[PDB]
């Protein structure tokens, strides 16, 4: 999706 | 009764052309055209000779004629396409190749040329397909075979690698022995196991091409200056490059011209490229004593005239056998001393090159037989990078302790910024971890750290904390494009997280940001061994190109590595690429062809780099950078030592912290990124060369002060 969205989320 | 007088003359011209009597070849061709104007073969042969001479316009005239006489002349269509391609008419060349393929579907040369156009434009699958088609039509096609081999190297397709390499060596030997132009490009010869004599000879033939192109000019030798009297005692140094602009070479040396001592030197910059509007070109134009746009002077004779009229004492080739090169200028020898410096990691093999500027680590005198030029040593390393000027925001960093009770991690959530210290001074309880005047601040898990992590996780571009601007590391182009390219220093505080690139929050990250062509099966084998010996550890590669990614993974699966042990990321803007190297623990240099600019990039991030120096220049640059850094423990004498050092860095976390801190300090303390010191030592070498020539001596090896 968005180029700024990360691969995974932090706890 | 096929033989005619014109047929005889065309033959005799062919014989004189194979003898190397090019002028007699064209005379006999023209005589044959005189006897028989509608002689299509004579038109084609004369056009081929003219195109080899650089007379592209007249060659296109004769090709178009020959195809008017014989509309089924597929070879003439293919060669007209080649001439148009040399004239930068890619659409016309494409039309010529496709018309040839339509006329004679069995004609292999047109398929090979179409594959060449596809490869030049970056369509590697298409180039591979057309090269395979051509080789199917003509199994003995050295040009198509070598270009296909390079395409496979680009995509890391190592199917039948050993047989491919052996066939490449055999083809190169056969073409050298028969005095034909080798089908392996000199820039690619560093990727194959030829003898150093083979690589030098390929370079020599490709320089001979420039010699043949300049002979038609019939220029007399230039009268070179014998003293510095006319230039106020200043050595006149002219850097010739097509990369004054947004190119890695400028990223390496853009500060050098402005750091030259005006009292003893006069700096001329000859750009072979037009202004591309970037700040690199602006800086070189504004800081050099004289900027000369040779892209406005296509005729090599007139551009060499300009170089000579400026009075250059030392002319510096920073292009070599790379793109945009105009070695014809150097073949005309307008300067008494001509030296290869930075852009080409190999020998020119050419007589018009007097020196190659290198160092003892990259080119020890033992292998001085690899290079046709004489060795000119820099004190520590010949490599330089402008990172201290382009990316000063990575000189200091800070981290967030996301893992509430987690021993401090330096590469999971990282912050960089020119205003980082003021931002931290606005924070309540920053903890300062000393690394053994250098320190890493740590932000505890506050609402502030939660806000930063929320910005990262939600994929937001930017936030504001205490009036300070905090930017997502992935959004630099959306905030300041000039900052992302490295043309400007970022004016916000940038956050970089492993979560942005899928890296393990709890594991060792080995990285290699080089183009995938530098990887060979042996290198992947060593990396697989290292990954097996370190638990949870992953290897971080780039989609460079993305079509190479599946290949690697496939091979990695045959060696026992799951798909989750190699993490691929897309190629990022320059600033983000250099910045995100902080997230890795150890970089693993490619032994076949070292990372050269990539090595500077990773070392600037403070990431220790493991190298195994080879024999070719390109395979030893990483080692030289590491010696100049002062990190001799990161250089390996064999594959096993390489693997041992890598797994030790991965498993001994205290040793990892020690070596990482060592690199973090040495990248400033050592001369590696010191552009002023590098310029001064280069000036010392320049004066060494000039005094050697001024005493009447022919060029010789320059080592020791
Ligand atoms: C084998 C070879 O020919 N190496 C040349 C190369 O070094 P080197 O091999 O390191 O660099 P490349 O030719 O592969 O160019 C890679 C460039 O892309 C940049 N990058 C990479 C990944 C990414 O995500 N984002 C990004 O911006 C790198 O910072 C670098 O500027 O260029 C130097 C500068 O001309 C030459 O002196 C070297 O001889």
The reply to whether B229-387+678-695 and B509-677 are identical in fold is: yes
Answer whether B501's CB lies under 8 Å from B540's CB: yes
The whole-angstrom separation of Cα B659 and Cα B666 is 10
Q: Tokens 């990285």 identify what position?
A: B511
Residue range B229-387+678-695 forms a domain whose CATH class is alpha beta
Best to test chain A binding among B400, B404, B459 (most A CBs inside 10 Å): B459
Rounded distance from Cα B513 to ligand 1 centre (Å)? 9
Atom of ligand 1 nearest to the CA of B190: 1
What values do phi and psi take at B41, rounded to 5? -65, -40
DSSP 8-state symbol, B206? H
Is the CB of A3 less than 8 angstroms away from the CB of B475?
A: yes
Question: Contacts of residue B499 in chain A, CB cutoff 8 Å?
Answer: 6-10
Residue B463 parent element (H or E): strand B462-465
Residue B239 DSSP one-character state: E
B98 labeled binding residue: no
Cα torsion B480, B482, B483, B489 to 10°: value is -120
Q: Which two tokens stand for residue B204?
A: 């020599």
Q: Give residues 60 to 119 of B whose Cβ lies within 8 Å of A.
A: none
Residue B264, classified by CB atoms within 10 Å of its CB into exposed (0-12), middle (13-18) or buried (19+), is middle
CA dist B356 to B197, B271, B652, Å?
Answer: 17, 20, 41
Sequence-ordered list of residues with C-beta below 8 angstroms from that of B644, at least 6 positions apart, any chain: B636
- The SS3 call for residue B339 is strand
Helix (H, G, I), strand (E, B) or coil at B235: strand
Does the annotation place B150 within a ligand binding site? no
- Give SS3 for B308: helix
Collapsed DSSP state (helix, strand, coil) of residue B587: strand
Q: How far apart are CA B257 and CA B341, in angstroms?
A: 14
Strand ranges (DSSP E) for B289-390?
Answer: 290-293, 314-317, 337-340, 355-359, 374-378
Neighbour tally for B658: CB within 10 Å:
14
- The end-to-end CA distance of chain A, in Å, is 21
Q: Is B417 in the pocket of ligand 1 (CB under 6 A)?
A: no
Instruction: DSSP letter for B345, please.
Output: S
Experimental resolution (Å)? 3.0
- Measured in whole angstroms, how far is the alpha carbon of residue B188 from the centre of its chain? 11
Tally the residues of chain A. Answer: 11
Residues of A in contact with B456 (CB under 8 A): 6, 10
CB A5 within 8 A of CB B459: yes
| Bridge partners, B109 (sequence order) | none
Cross-chain Cβ contact B402/A11 below 8 Å: yes
Phi-psi region of B502 (alpha: psi -120 to 50; beta: other; left: phi over 0): left
B343 Cβ closer than 6 Å to some ligand 1 atom: yes
Closest CA to B586 of B631, B545, B553, B543: B631
What does the DSSP 8-state code read for residue B443?
A: E
The token pair that represents B106 in the structure block: 């069995």
Any A CB within 8 A of B144 CB: no
- B486 backbone φψ class: left, alpha, beta (φ>0; ψ -120 to 50): left
Active site residue B187: yes
Question: CA of B470 to nearest chain A CA: how many angstroms apart?
Answer: 14
Identify the residue whose tokens are 């801190």.
B661
DSSP state of B296: G
* DSSP E strand boundaries for B491-597: 493-497, 509-511, 538-542, 566-569, 586-588
Asked whether the beta carbons of B373 and B340 are under 8 A apart, the reply is: yes
- The DSSP 8-state label assigned to residue B312 in this structure reads -
Please choose, from the candidates B12, B699, B11, the residue with its C-alpha nearest in 3D space to the C-alpha of residue B375. B699
Atom from ligand 1 closest to the CA of residue B383: 37
Adjacency order of strands within the sheet including B374-378: B290-293, B265-271, B235-241, B314-317, B337-340, B355-359, B374-378
Closest CA to B498 of B399, B385, B589, B580: B580
Radius of gyration of chain A (CA): 8
User: What topology does CATH give the domain B388-500?
Assistant: 3.30.720
Closest in B453, B459, B478 to A10, CB measured = B453
Whole-number Å distance between alpha carbons of B671 and B158: 39
For residue B214, report the phi and psi dihedrals to the nearest 5 degrees.
Answer: -85, -20
Closest alpha carbon to B66 in B33, B24, B91, B98: B33
Alpha helices, DSSP H, located in B288-352: 300-310, 328-331
The whole-angstrom separation of Cα B577 and Cα B204 is 36
How deeply is B210 buried, as exposed, middle or buried, from its count of CB atoms within 10 A (0-12, 13-18, 19+)?
A: buried
What is the distance between the alpha carbons of residues B646 and B386, in angstroms, rounded to a whole number? 28
Give, in order, the Cα–Cα distances in Å from B384 to each of B378, B388, B597.
Answer: 11, 11, 9
Token duo for residue B128: 């591979």
b/e B492-512 (16+ beta carbons within 10 angstroms → b): bbbbbbbbbbebbbebbbbbb
Tokens of B427: 């924070």
CB atoms under 10 Å from CB of B429, counted, come to 8
CB B618 within 8 A of CB B596: yes
Does the beta-carbon distance from B456 to A10 stay under 8 Å? yes
Cβ-in-10-Å burial (0-12, 13-18, 19+) of B288 comes to buried
DSSP codes joined into one string, B74-111: HHHHHHHHHHHHHTT-HHHHHHHHHHHHHH-TT-HHHH
Which residue is catalytic, options B150, B187, B188, B313? Answer: B187
Yes or no: say if B368 and B616 are a contact pair by the CB < 8 Å rule: no
- Give me the phi and psi of B148, to 5 degrees please: -65, -40
List the CATH code of the domain at B509-677: 3.40.50.2000
Contact B608, B659 (CB under 8 A): yes
In this structure, what are the phi and psi dihedrals at residue B541, rounded to the nearest 5 degrees?
-120, 170
Q: Are B256 and B250 in contact (CB under 8 A)?
A: no
> Both tokens of residue B592?
């076949």
Contact call for residues B597 and B624 (beta carbons, < 8 A): no
Signed CA dihedral, B593, B120, B274, B206: sign only: positive
Q: Which tokens is B327 given?
A: 């070695």
Q: How was this one solved?
A: X-ray
Using a CB-CB distance cutoff of 8 angstroms, which residues of chain A are in contact with residue B475?
3-4
Q: Using alpha carbons, select from B514, B528, B582 the residue that is nearest to residue B558.
A: B528
User: What is the distance in angstroms between the CA of the first residue and the CA of the last residue of chain B?
Assistant: 74
CA–CA separation, B674 vs B487, rounded Å?
Answer: 19
Q: How many CA atoms lie within 13 A of B64 on its CB side?
A: 10
CA distance B145 to B665: 47
CA distance B102 to B168: 31
Q: Which of B582, B572, B573, B575 is nearest to B667 (CA)?
A: B582
């Amino acid at each position: 999706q968005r180029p700024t969205q990360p691969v995974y989320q932090i706890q | 009764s096929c033989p005619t007088h014109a047929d005889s003359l065309n033959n005799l011209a062919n014989i004189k052309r194979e003898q190397g009597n090019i002028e007699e070849a064209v005379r006999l061709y023209r005589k044959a055209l005189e006897v028989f104007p509608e002689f299509a073969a004579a038109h084609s042969n004369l056009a081929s000779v003219l195109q080899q001479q650089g007379k592209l316009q007249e060659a296109l005239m004769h090709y178009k004629e020959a195809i008017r006489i014989s509309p089924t002349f597929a070879d003439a269509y293919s060669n007209m396409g080649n001439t148009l391609k040399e004239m930068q008419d890619v659409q016309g060349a494409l039309q010529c190749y496709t018309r040839a393929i339509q006329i004679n579907p069995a004609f292999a040369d047109a398929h090979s040329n179409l594959a060449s156009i596809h490869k030049d434009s970056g369509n590697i699958p298409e180039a591979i397909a057309s090269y395979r088609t051509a080789l199917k039509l003509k199994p003995d096609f050295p040009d198509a075979y070598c270009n296909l081999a390079h395409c496979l190297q680009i995509v890391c397709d190592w199917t039948d690698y050993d047989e491919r390499m052996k066939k490449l060596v055999s083809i190169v030997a056969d073409q050298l022995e028969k005095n034909r132009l080798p089908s392996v490009h000199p820039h690619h010869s560093m990727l194959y196991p030829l003898s150093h004599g083979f690589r030098k000879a390929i370079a020599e033939r490709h320089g001979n091409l420039c010699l043949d192109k300049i002979n038609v000019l019939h220029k007399p030798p230039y009268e070179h200056p014998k003293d510095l009297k006319l230039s106020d005692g200043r050595l006149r140094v002219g850097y010739v490059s097509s990369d004054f602009g947004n190119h890695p070479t400028s990223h390496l040396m853009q500060s050098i011209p402005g750091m030259h001592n005006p009292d003893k030197f006069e700096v001329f910059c000859y750009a072979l490229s037009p202004d591309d509007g970037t700040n690199f070109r602006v800086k070189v134009m504004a800081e050099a004593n004289h900027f000369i746009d040779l892209s406005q002077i296509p005729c090599n004779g007139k551009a060499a005239d300009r170089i000579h009229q400026d009075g250059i004492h030392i002319l510096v080739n920073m292009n070599g056998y790379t793109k945009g090169a105009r070695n014809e200028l150097f073949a005309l020898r307008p300067a008494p001393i001509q030296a290869m410096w930075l852009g080409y990691p190999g020998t020119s093999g050419a007589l018009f090159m007097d020196y190659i500027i290198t160092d003892q680590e990259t080119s020890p005198a033992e292998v001085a037989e690899q290079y046709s030029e004489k060795l000119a040593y820099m004190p520590h390393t010949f490599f330089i990078g402008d990172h201290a000027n382009m990316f000063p925001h990575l000189k200091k960093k800070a981290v967030i302790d996301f893992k509430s009770n987690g021993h401090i991690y330096d590469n999971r959530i990282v912050l960089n910024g020119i205003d980082l210290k003021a931002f931290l001074d606005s924070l309540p309880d920053v903890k300062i971890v000393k690394m053994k005047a250098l320190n890493m601040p740590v932000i505890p898990m506050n609402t502030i750290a939660e806000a930063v992590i929320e910005m990262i996780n939600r994929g937001q571009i930017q936030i504001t904390i205490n009036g300070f601007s905090i930017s997502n590391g992935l959004a630099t182009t959306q905030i300041n494009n000039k900052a992302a390219t490295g043309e400007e220093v970022p004016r916000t505080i940038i956050v970089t997280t492993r979560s942005q690139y899928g890296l393990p929050e709890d594991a060792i990250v080995y990285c290699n940001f080089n183009q995938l062509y530098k990887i060979d099966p042996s290198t992947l084998q060593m990396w697989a061994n290292i990954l097996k010996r370190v638990p949870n550890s992953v290897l971080w590669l780039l989609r460079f190109p993305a079509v190479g990614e599946p290949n690697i993974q496939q091979y990695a699966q045959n060696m026992g590595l799951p798909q989750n042990r190699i993490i691929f990321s897309p190629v990022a803007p320059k600033e983000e690429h250099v910045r995100r190297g902080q997230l890795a623990d150890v970089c693993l240099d490619t032994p076949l062809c070292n990372g050269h600019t990539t090595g500077m990039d990773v070392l600037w991030a403070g990431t220790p780099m493991v190298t195994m120096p080879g024999e070719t220049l390109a395979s030893r640059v990483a080692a030289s950078q590491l010696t100049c850094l002062g990190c001799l423990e990161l250089i390996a004498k064999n594959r096993q030592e390489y693997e041992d050092i890598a797994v030790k860095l991965g498993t001994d976390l205290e040793y990892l912290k020690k070596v990482r801190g060592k690199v973090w300090k040495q990248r400033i303390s050592s001369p590696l990124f010191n552009t002023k010191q590098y310029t001064m030592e280069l000036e010392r070498l320049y004066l060494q060369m000039w005094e050697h020539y001024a005493a009447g001596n022919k060029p010789d090896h320059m080592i020791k002060p």
